[PDB]
Amino acid sequence: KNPKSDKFKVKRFHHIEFWCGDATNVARRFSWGLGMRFSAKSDLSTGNMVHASYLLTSGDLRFLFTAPYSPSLSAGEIKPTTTASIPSFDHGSCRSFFSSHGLGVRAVAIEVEDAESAFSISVANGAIPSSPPIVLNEAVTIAEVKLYGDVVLRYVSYKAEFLPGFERVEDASSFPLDYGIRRLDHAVGNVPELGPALTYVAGFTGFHQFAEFESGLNSAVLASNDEMVLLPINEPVHGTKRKSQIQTYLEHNEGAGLQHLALMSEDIFRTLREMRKRSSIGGFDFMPSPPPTYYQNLKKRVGDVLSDDQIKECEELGILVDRDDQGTLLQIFTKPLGDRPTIFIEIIQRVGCMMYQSGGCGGFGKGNFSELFKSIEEYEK
Amino acid sequence: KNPKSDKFKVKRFHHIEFWCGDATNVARRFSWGLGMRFSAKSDLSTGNMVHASYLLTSGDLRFLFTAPYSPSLSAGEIKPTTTASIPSFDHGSCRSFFSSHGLGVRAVAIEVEDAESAFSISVANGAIPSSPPIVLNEAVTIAEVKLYGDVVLRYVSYKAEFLPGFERVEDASSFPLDYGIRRLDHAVGNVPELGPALTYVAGFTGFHQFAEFESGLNSAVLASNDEMVLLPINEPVHGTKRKSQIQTYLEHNEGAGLQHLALMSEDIFRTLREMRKRSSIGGFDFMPSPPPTYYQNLKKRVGDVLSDDQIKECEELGILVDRDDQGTLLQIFTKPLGDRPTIFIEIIQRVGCMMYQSGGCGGFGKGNFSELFKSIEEYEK
Numbered sequence: 001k002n003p004k005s006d007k008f009k010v011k012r013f014h015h016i017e018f019w020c021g022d023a024t025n026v027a028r029r030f031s032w033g034l035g036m037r038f039s040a041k042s043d044l045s046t047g048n049m050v051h052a053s054y055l056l057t058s059g060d061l062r063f064l065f066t067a068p069y070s071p072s073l074s075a076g077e078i079k080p081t082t083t084a085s086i087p088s089f090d091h092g093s094c095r096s097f098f099s100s101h102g103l104g105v106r107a108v109a110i111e112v113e114d115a116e117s118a119f120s121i122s123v124a125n126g127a128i129p130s131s132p133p134i135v136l137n138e139a140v141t142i143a144e145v146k147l148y149g150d151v152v153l154r155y156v157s158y159k160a161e162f163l164p165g166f167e168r169v170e171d172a173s174s175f176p177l178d179y180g181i182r183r184l185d186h187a188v189g190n191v192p193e194l195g196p197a198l199t200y201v202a203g204f205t206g207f208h209q210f211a212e213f214e215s216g217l218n219s220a221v222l223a224s225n226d227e228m229v230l231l232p233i234n235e236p237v238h239g240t241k242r243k244s245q246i247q248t249y250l251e252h253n254e255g256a257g258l259q260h261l262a263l264m265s266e267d268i269f270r271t272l273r274e275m276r277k278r279s280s281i282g283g284f285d286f287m288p289s290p291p292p293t294y295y296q297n298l299k300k301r302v303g304d305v306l307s308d309d310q311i312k313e314c315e316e317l318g319i320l321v322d323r324d325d326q327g328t329l330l331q332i333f334t335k336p337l338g339d340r341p342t343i344f345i346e347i348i349q350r351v352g353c354m355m356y357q358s359g360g361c362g363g364f365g366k367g368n369f370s371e372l373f374k375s376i377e378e379y380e381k
Numbered sequence: 382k383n384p385k386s387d388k389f390k391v392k393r394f395h396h397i398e399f400w401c402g403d404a405t406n407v408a409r410r411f412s413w414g415l416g417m418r419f420s421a422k423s424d425l426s427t428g429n430m431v432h433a434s435y436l437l438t439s440g441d442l443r444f445l446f447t448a449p450y451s452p453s454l455s456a457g458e459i460k461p462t463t464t465a466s467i468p469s470f471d472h473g474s475c476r477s478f479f480s481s482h483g484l485g486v487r488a489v490a491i492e493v494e495d496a497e498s499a500f501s502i503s504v505a506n507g508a509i510p511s512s513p514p515i516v517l518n519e520a521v522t523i524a525e526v527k528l529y530g531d532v533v534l535r536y537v538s539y540k541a542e543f544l545p546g547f548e549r550v551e552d553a554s555s556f557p558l559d560y561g562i563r564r565l566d567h568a569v570g571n572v573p574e575l576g577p578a579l580t581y582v583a584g585f586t587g588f589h590q591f592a593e594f595e596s597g598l599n600s601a602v603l604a605s606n607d608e609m610v611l612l613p614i615n616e617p618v619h620g621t622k623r624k625s626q627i628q629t630y631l632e633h634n635e636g637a638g639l640q641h642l643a644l645m646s647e648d649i650f651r652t653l654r655e656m657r658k659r660s661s662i663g664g665f666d667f668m669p670s671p672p673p674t675y676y677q678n679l680k681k682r683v684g685d686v687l688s689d690d691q692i693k694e695c696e697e698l699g700i701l702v703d704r705d706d707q708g709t710l711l712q713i714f715t716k717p718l719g720d721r722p723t724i725f726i727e728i729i730q731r732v733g734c735m736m737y738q739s740g741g742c743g744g745f746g747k748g749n750f751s752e753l754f755k756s757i758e759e760y761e762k
């Protein structure tokens with residue numbers, strides 16, 4: 001059931017913004033590790049005396065990395081005279097965010113029909129305002145409300161290239177890397193208490209609970225009208241034998257925040273081949289692969305969707321497979337992106353639910369917790 | 382003239398420590414860009430609840446990247462019960478350093494005969510103490526004094542692998558990258574006033590002025606007894622037509638700090654080939670190459686040291702060449718390592734002064750300021 005109760009017109013995920021201490025080094029690491037091209041910049045060379053912001057793109061996926069300059073460079077500015085290209089940016093907020101949480105996602109940005117209306121309706125329905133709507137060069141409107149912890153939901157709307165004040169990157173500085181990643185599939189938060197978090201966000205968005213199907217978590221998924229914007233949220237389950245990874249997150253993150261970004265690939269085999277080649281030369285590491293028991297067990301579960309060669313290719317790359325009543329999910333998880341055991345990335349590809357593909361086809365892989373555990377026990381025997 | 386006036390026995394440069402916001406991302410970027418292998422770690426997985434520290438090595442060059450965890454992880458600790466592997470580390474100091482200066486060098490570490498003696502003699506001769514001598518596992522002693530700005534000179538001495546509490550890295554996580562870099566040749570500071578900086582450092586070390594031979598700077602070089610530890614210092618020259626890059630440094634860095642690290646290569650051609658291949662895929666960019674006039678002019682200056690093919694190889698890679706009365710210097714400079722126009726790296730190789738090679742053979746390339754300017758003007762004509 002999808003009651004289509006969005007309180008304003010939402011289109012798709014637009015970008016994800018990381019708040020960094022040094023945007024250059026994080027952006028260069030991410031570019032090489034994920035196969036994303038340098039696409040736009042806003043920094044000293046573009047007249048921005050406030051913050052350095054670098055945009056990476058792969059297909060429709062947009063990662064923004066932002067870090068503050070010394071406040072002394074902009075000490076004479078006021079908001080009416082700012083050289084910042086992102087008017088919501090604040091030196092103190094960014095330094096405090098990074099001190100508290102380390103490297104992580106500050107903003108989950110969605111494109112909407114009218115950011116000023118989305119902001120007004122959201123706040124009228126309980127959203128905690130973070131940054132009021134600001135019109136940039138009479139061309140783009142951006143506004144921000146609190147999502148969870150210190151993460152904001154950012155609304156962006158275009159009258160008719162990223163943001164005014166950003167320059168396209170000189171293609172000599174823009175190597176055309178591409179490992180197959182194409183868009184953001186979902187963005188997941190960790191919170192201490194799931195119920196109040198869901199009530200808050202569904203309250204101000206009108207997002208509905210996405211239909212789904214004892215190890216760590218309780219979760220639920222909020223979805224836009226066409227279920228293309230997907231915001232799962234997790235809470236820990238306390239008192240178990242193996243400590244909940246959600247609770248570990250909350251301890252090392254200093255509270256609620258974004259847990260993982262799931263990036264859709266148009267060819268998950270190629271993406272994982274390319275990412276794994278680079279794991280030890282600057283890129284990203286992956287979680288330990290499941291035992292061969294797990295792949296022997298794949299034949300009985302997905303042998304009608306994947307051939308034996310396709311299954312052994314999953315085994316080569318450590319790919320997990322799960323199944324809905326409608327579609328099949330291929331997924332794999334990186335180790336944490338930075339120093340703290342907090343944020344990580346998921347690579348996914350979905351098969352089925354053809355109409356275009358419907359959002360959330362195959363689910364989110366919750367069935368893979370049990371399957372992984374069983375495979376580990378069976379391999380031990 | 383070298384009066385050999387060191388007040389304690391100094392051996393060689395030992396390591397350089399960067400203070401970061403996220404040590405993982407900076408270390409991975411640097412590893413790929415410079416061809417340095419992951420060699421040791423001290424972090425949550427080794428029992429360090431205070432800071433994450435990753436060591437990269439290439440030959441004898443050692444780069445350490447350190448970032449603080451949330452203070453909450455170590456809130457119950459006191460210095461006598463610390464899990465930090467570097468006892469001088471302080472959460473507040475590190476966060477304040479990074480807020481003020483951005484990504485940069487906190488410590489220039491030299492190996493000495495006896496770090497406790499070096500510290501005592503240094504402070505008795507005017508050094509401002511930063512961290513007192515601490516003996517680690519009855520095996521290594523480390524102490525720190527102020528060098529300039531918020532940079533410390535770190536003394537390390539070994540009774541008889543990096544530091545106790547660091548673990549060697551599992552070689553599956555240690556890809557054997559190597560682009561030819563072998564050691565730190567010199568480390569350079571920028572200060573507002575050269576005279577007082579020189580008097581201070583030479584005062585407490587006994588380092589002597591290194592013998593040398595109107596665009597930006599005044600500089601001088603302090604050297605150890607065998608002139609293997611080389612610490613140049615620059616001050617700006619104000620009131621010129623083109624603004625001094627030393628003054629730009631001081632403005633964006635919020636004062637004095639480390640300007641550049643010069644890394645000796647055993648094969649500067651191979652190093653630059655490998656680094657330039659990676660500039661746009663996560664590595665480091667280089668300053669704009671000199672005009673062909675500069676390389677046409679090389680024949681008359683170094684045509685007795687380099688063949689025509691060796692000179693055109695310099696032209697392929699943008700390498701600068703300068704000459705002493707004793708030796709020849711090949712050098713090139715990266716663009717700034719991070720967001721701010723502050724710290725950068727120099728790659729160098731020296732030819733001549735064979736006895737082993739004597740330190741500082743060929744100088745530091747100050748003659749290349751004039752040669753670059755002349756080449757630019759001649760190319761314009």
Ligand SMILES: Cc1c(C(=O)C2=C(O)CCCC2=O)ccc2c1c(=O)n(Cc1ccc(F)cc1)c(=O)n2C
Nearest residue numbers: 188219232245260287333346364365366368369372
């Ligand atoms: C994050 C994740 C998901 C996931 O995407 C997801 C959502 O999108 C929304 C609903 C809740 C949720 O969970 C699915 C399966 C995962 C993982 C995952 O993180 N891990 C990692 C892990 C490894 C060993 C260990 F001991 C503990 C955790 C998995 O193993 N599976 C199998």
Ligand SMILES: Cc1c(C(=O)C2=C(O)CCCC2=O)ccc2c1c(=O)n(Cc1ccc(F)cc1)c(=O)n2C
Nearest residue numbers: 569600613626641668714727745746747749750753
């Ligand atoms: C840092 C450097 C050195 C150097 O190593 C050095 C020391 O070790 C100690 C003594 C002082 C000193 O300077 C030598 C030559 C350099 C540079 C350098 O930084 N640049 C970069 C530059 C480019 C364009 C522009 F407009 C301004 C600066 C150069 O061009 N040359 C030619």
Ligand SMILES: [Co+2]
Nearest residue numbers: 188262346364
């Ligand atoms: Co997921």
Ligand SMILES: [Co+2]
Nearest residue numbers: 569643727745
């Ligand atoms: Co130099």
